[PDB]
């Protein structure tokens, strides 16, 4: 069993949570999970999990 937090250790390169319970990081919503959430039309859930909870940031383009 594992449940972590809204916060914890992150990867210095990607900014995403560390992998698994051993690193005290997060769990993976993988490629197939995004296929299911897209098939359902649940885009605000994708923003919540893939952006707000994983590594979402602000980019500035001229």
Contacts with another protein by CB under 8 A lie at 20-21, 27-28, 30-33, 35, 38
Q: How far is the CB of 22 from another protein (least distance, A)?
A: 9
Nearer Cβ to another protein, position 1 or 58? 1
Nearer Cβ to another protein, position 28 or 51? 28
Rg for the chain, CA atoms, rounded: 13
User: Using CA atoms, how far apart are residues 8 and 42, in angstroms rounded to an integer?
Assistant: 26
Nearer Cβ to another protein, position 1 or 5? 1
User: Using CA atoms, how far apart are residues 48 and 31, in angstroms rounded to an integer?
Assistant: 16
Question: Does residue 57 contact residue 15 with C-beta atoms inside 8 Å?
Answer: yes
């Amino acid at each position: 069993r594992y449940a972590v937090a809204s916060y914890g250790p992150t990867d210095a390169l990607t900014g995403q949570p560390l992998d698994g319970k051993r690193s005290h990081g997060g769990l993976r919503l993988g490629e197939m999970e995004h296929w299911v959430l897209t098939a359902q039309g649940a885009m605000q859930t994708i923003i919540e999990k893939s952006h707000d909870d994983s590594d979402g940031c602000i980019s500035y383009i001229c």
